[PDB]
Amino acid sequence: GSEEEIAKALEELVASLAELKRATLKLLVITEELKKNPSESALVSHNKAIVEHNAIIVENNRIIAAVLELIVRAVGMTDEILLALLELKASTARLKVATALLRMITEELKKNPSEDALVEHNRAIVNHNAIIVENNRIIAAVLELIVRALNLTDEEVRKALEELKASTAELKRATASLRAITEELKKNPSEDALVEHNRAIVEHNAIIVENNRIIALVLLLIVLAI
Amino acid sequence: GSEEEIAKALEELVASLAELKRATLKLLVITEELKKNPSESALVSHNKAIVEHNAIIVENNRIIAAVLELIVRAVGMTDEILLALLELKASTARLKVATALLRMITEELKKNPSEDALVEHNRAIVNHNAIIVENNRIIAAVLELIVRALNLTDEEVRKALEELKASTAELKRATASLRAITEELKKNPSEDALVEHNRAIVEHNAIIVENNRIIALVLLLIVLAI
Amino acid sequence: GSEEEIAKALEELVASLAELKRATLKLLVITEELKKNPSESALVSHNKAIVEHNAIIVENNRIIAAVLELIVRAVGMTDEILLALLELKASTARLKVATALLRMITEELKKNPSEDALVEHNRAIVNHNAIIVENNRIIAAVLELIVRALNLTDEEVRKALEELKASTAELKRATASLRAITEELKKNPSEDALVEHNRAIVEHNAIIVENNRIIALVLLLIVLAI
Amino acid sequence: GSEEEIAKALEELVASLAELKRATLKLLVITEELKKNPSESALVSHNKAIVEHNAIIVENNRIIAAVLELIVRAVGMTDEILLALLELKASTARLKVATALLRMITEELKKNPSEDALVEHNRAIVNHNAIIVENNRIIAAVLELIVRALNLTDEEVRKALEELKASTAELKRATASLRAITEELKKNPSEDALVEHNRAIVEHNAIIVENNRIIALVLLLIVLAI
Amino acid sequence: GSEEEIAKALEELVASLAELKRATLKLLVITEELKKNPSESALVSHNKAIVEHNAIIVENNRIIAAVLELIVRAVGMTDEILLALLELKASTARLKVATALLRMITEELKKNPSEDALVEHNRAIVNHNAIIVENNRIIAAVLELIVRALNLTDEEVRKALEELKASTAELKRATASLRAITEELKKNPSEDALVEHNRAIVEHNAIIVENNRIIALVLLLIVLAI
Amino acid sequence: GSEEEIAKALEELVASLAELKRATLKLLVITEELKKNPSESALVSHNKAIVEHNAIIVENNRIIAAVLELIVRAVGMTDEILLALLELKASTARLKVATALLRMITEELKKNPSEDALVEHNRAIVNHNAIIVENNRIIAAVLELIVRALNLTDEEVRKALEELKASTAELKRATASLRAITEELKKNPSEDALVEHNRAIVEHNAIIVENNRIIALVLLLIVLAI
Amino acid sequence: GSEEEIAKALEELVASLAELKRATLKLLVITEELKKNPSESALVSHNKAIVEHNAIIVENNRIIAAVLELIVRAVGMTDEILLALLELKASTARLKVATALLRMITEELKKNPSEDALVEHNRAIVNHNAIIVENNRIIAAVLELIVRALNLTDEEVRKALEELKASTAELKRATASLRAITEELKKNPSEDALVEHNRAIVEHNAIIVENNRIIALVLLLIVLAI
Amino acid sequence: GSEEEIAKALEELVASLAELKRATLKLLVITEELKKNPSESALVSHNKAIVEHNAIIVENNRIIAAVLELIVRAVGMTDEILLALLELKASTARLKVATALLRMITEELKKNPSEDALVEHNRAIVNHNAIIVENNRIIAAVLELIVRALNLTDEEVRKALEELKASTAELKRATASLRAITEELKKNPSEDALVEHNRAIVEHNAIIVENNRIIALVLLLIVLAI
């Protein structure tokens, strides 16, 4: 694309990041309210808020994939870039599918809520997040390839990539930890467990938001360096 | 006011009536869903929807009171009209107060829901409706006085006032019946009772919407007859 | 206004006239179908179609009144013109009011139809049409005044005004005849009468459409003559 | 098809489900309105609304058959899959035929309504629904075959298939019950019966909508598992 | 005042309550952010946010005192009411003074921040809150007197006063607890203590906001009962 | 005075302090601009800005003296307080006189500027400031007496008085230093000296503003302690 | 554009210049306050103020680019003008990108401040300013081309271009000097260095504001000469 | 516009004329004071006062152009009127531009005054005045056309036009004379010359104010004659 398109899309990206931050703060609020005064309708409303937060994350990842497609068409594809973009487009479609899945089981829970339904819903949130994680790893791999293909020497870019790789390994560890406590919850579901679990979900989402911030810094540095 | 103001406000009134009808249909839907699949979060969301329906009714009554003030300033006040308009302005303010009261106990229920809280909330809904009813009785008395002051001979107007008086007596009977079952619920609260009670509330609200339809026919006939 | 505004608004007027003609043809179709195979649901659907046809007429008269306001601001007001435009603006508001009245009793008939409701609805249609007629008489008087104020000597204009005065007297006669058979129906209501009456209504609407055609010829001739 | 096509079509599917839910809520509303104030024109309009709801269901089933064809072309046909898809394509054509039949007898009823015509129309609605049921049984058999062919071990998928088989047996029972009361109505047609019958139709349609929701959950789980 | 003034002022009160709730949620957010990533500039900005939250509480108490003066002029003063209103007006002025004091030492901290300055600022926040508490105790005493003076028998009012007396004793206990940990901090100041202390402050402010909610329920119930 | 008067006057005091701070910032700006690009019209305009800043300080000191008179009438006079208030009233009048003197020689400088006139004007600013200093010493002595007369044990008050005594000794030293460089300028006047001198003046005014801040903290602590 | 558009946009430009001047004065104030009383939260707030000042400069440059596009469309493009406007639009987009980059690392610093973060932030401010400088060089080249293309003989214009070229060479030298002290700071970061560095930044920003003033004089002279 | 708008705008015009007269008297005062006691800061302040006087003249000319647009829309445009109004709107925009130019070089002079800067500023005042003169010639041409288009026979109007044409030729001669002495000053700049020149400027501004008075008499006579 043209420099106007890239710049406009980065304005949309930074707008989406501000919106994502605002939503994360709100979600932390309602997480605290649920912790202090836990109840079944509080659990249902908290889960629905997590679904709307995840939908915002998915739109953020869509905008990032769009920007990357415009950037790569600017610089030119390469074998490893093209293979990573085909992996990215596949993961994007898989995410739209899991997003619809989550929204539909959310509506089932809202209509017919129960503790078993909350457990099933939390497990589906954890799977949705694991798909977001894989989306972020592929986007990070794309940015790694774009920088190595340019041979870009900016120390600010190298520093931001060291941050992005650290955040990625941290995100793998946090994902594994969340799947572990999810397998505990599935074994021993209880309201106290549902609360502790939703807390761990919100921590995982916060780490994903930090990952998306670092990703956006890498995109901004690349678009300035070309 | 001028014919443009009166006509514009009656366009706003008919718009508010269409919105009120739509909301009544929606409330009947969620009432059926609650009857078929009753649950605590369903009860909370149903009650909040009832609160938003009542807020639409209150805005309808505000627009009606505005139109009547423009109509009376068109024709001229009279002793009994002026005393009824002072009663109307008082009842309008009392309704704004009870509206805030209801919204605030609604937020308390949403935050900390329980069966006792549902009983208290249903009793407060029944008191809010009883205030709406008194607002409608005063508005009907105003229209009765306006027609008698004009000495209007239109058989369409006389017919519409016979409908309005029948609707008013019907609304008194329905209000008394709803207060009776509310006193039953307060004695013997149970989920099955909460469901039967919310059903009777929705029937009462439907009767109030019929009252507002008849009131709007009287206003339209008067504005044509002047 | 400017020549572009007047011309655009006359394009909207001729579009509304084509739509009005099309609606009149459709209404004649369903009138014939009702005559051949009369039934209660056919009566209800025919009446609702008459209400939508009347709504098209009302929009036509609104556009005509708009054009006249732009034309008079083009030429300049005069005492008799200003008094006729104040009469026109009043009649426009009265028509919007009666239009809402008709639509609301239409919804009452559709929801709770019966023969008595059909009689009352037909009488209200006849009153709505009588208000359309008064709107057209005032619009014709305005055009008569605009032409006399210009002192316009065009024989095409004089001919079109002789047509407009003949159409106006014809419309008065047809309105009186329709009120007469309406008083018959109200005295002796029957399905066969309801059918014959709806036929006479459709003839009256056809005469109103001829009136609107002549009015549009006068506006076009005036806008060319200025 | 490609992952983009499948994902797009599932977005269209979830859109169709939202539209179907909205239509089901509306249909329940008008069913209540008919129950409270039953009348011949109410019966005709209710039946026409049922026809538009069924047309939405048919479009839903078309989109499901399209998605399944793209999924099977993704995985590859097998003997039992190909035979079930030929059965599905036959049932799809049979449904388009019965849909046109229903729409045409609907137009006959609307044009020439009578109690006998209402009975005949309700019986044709019950036959149309029975064809929808057979379409759903074939779609469920196809999904059962697709999952068994993949050898998919996901416990979420097994649970969703246990839900789909339970919904299918429930839908068989409900279909039999509706044909039984239809044979009663045909024996003893009356307005009170026509109302009770239309109510049972709307309950049957609600069960079909639950079946389509579960079917969509199975498709989403399959598309994620491949 | 008049019913219009009272109703308007209660609309302003409920608006102030919504604003206060929103500010409390925001303050909980930044409290969590400070807990996770504590730092000197984070401490300064958190304290400034607490100062703006307290200023919102003070405006809430001003509006409550205004409403109470209009309510008492509606009912009439009495010896104990007049003495409590003079005590209320004194406490209102003392609060405006302490508000200015707090804002000025806040500006000193912002300009020349250090750990000692944070300790002094936290102690001054705790004194400001203790003054808010005394203002709320006097407002509760006024409402207790107004209800006893009316001799109001409404069980809803008695229930709300049992809530208000419980909230008042709870607020005394929380105030004492906060002064105790404040005396600890002054004895043993450390960044870990500053964080734990600011947490306890935010809990105390949350209890004050609950007190203001109960106070508003009492005012609304009284204004409906007169 | 009453608590309302004292509180209002302290709101006026804090407003005057905010205005004084803003003016001090502006004066530092124009001091930098004069330092960078010194010129005769810049010198004249800088001096006039210093005169308006001093007028703001004088209004601040008038408001402080008013507040102190209301506070002392609240607590009661004493021998040493009454003698200090007579000293304060004398210094207040002497300041109003020197303020008029300064404004008049300011107008002489503006009208007939020259280097000699700038020297004389700067020396008159330094004398005006020395009178402000004496006003502040008397105000501090009054507050010292009021606190000792109450026998007030608040450690916050003792701390603020240790700040006020340190600020007072600092202000004596700074005043002496400014008179010293003023005697240098008078001996060896030059534009470079005029600039360095105006810089030292602005530092002196900043120290006076710090003194007025501490004085206001003492007044606020006293008014809370009574 | 039309002369009305150009004149309006120059009113917007002069408004932006007044706002920029006011912001520059404010920034000099806080630079002095930081110099006198340096602290970590003071450093963070100073940097944030520099970011808001830079955002105002960027909006100024956007308005200048808009005006130039309207001016060139007024006079007509030429080969070198069109190539310079494409260079200008590229630099404009690059500036919007770097502006978002700076704002985001600003939020990182505000959230997680440390001395290393202040150094990194100062280096990013210096890069943002270097991009502003390149934007100004391209805008000056555009104005040089527009004047040479017009062949404008006004000695006032030639004088203003001699000022603009001198300011441009001065701005190159100042940019190089600031990058030099930035490389010193990066080698030997310390709070005393951070203060001296932020001072040099504020001097650089002041020189950019002088450049924007001269640029605006050239635009005004050109728009008068055409 | 309506007669109320025209009358209101003529009240605004006469208010602007009174303000302009008052400002002219003040400017003559400061011209005398500068003549008696000339000095650099006196020169700078005199020039700034001339800039504020010119801004008042520009607002006067804006109001005159507004009134003329309402008057011409009252009478109707004509070919020569429309071409003169397009010339007027162009000259109005050019004047807003030169007004901003003058204010900005005024701020440059105030900030960095010197004899060369005073010469350049006086020459820019003389160019600004020459643009005011062209604005007045176009306004006079418009009024000449409006009167000739009406064919107005009032001898009071003819007399006022003989005054306006004499004033216009006088204003051309005075403008030329002022440009001549401006070219002298530019050749031989000295303080004695700057004083004599500013005197001639103030005489020129007085002649422009006489022109604006005559213009206002023509507008008043026209508005009475229509």
Author numbering:
A (entry chain F), B (entry chain P), C (entry chain O), D (entry chain E), E (entry chain Q), F (entry chain R), ...: 1 to 226
The authors write:
Here we describe the de novo design of pH-responsive protein filaments built from subunits containing six or nine buried histidine residues that assemble into micrometre-scale, well-ordered fibres at neutral pH.
The DpHF18 subunit structure and the primary (largest) interface between subunits in the filament are very similar in the cryo-EM structure and computational model. However, the second small hetero interface deviates from the design model, resulting in antiparallel dihedral symmetry (D1) in addition to the helical symmetry generated by the main interface. Even small deviations in the geometry of the designed interfaces from the fibre design model will compound as the fibre propagates and can lead to non-specific aggregation or alterations in fibre geometry, as observed for the DpHF18 design. Pre-assembled DpHF18–Cy5 fibres were mixed with freshly disassembled DpHF18–Oregon488 monomers at pH 8, and growth of Oregon488-labelled fibres was observed at both tips of the Cy5-labelled seed fibres, indicating that the fibres grow from their ends. To study the dynamics of DpHF18 filament disassembly, we assembled DpHF18–Cy5 fibres and reduced the pH from 8 to 3 in a flow cell while imaging with TIRFM. We observed disassembly in less than 1 s after the pH drop. The fibre lengths dropped very fast at pH 3.1, while remaining stable at pH 3.4, demonstrating a sharp pH transition over 0.3 pH units. The sharpness of the pH dependence probably arises from the very large number of protonatable groups: each subunit contained six (DpHF18 and DpHF19) or nine (DpHF19_9his) buried histidines, and the fibres contained hundreds of subunits.
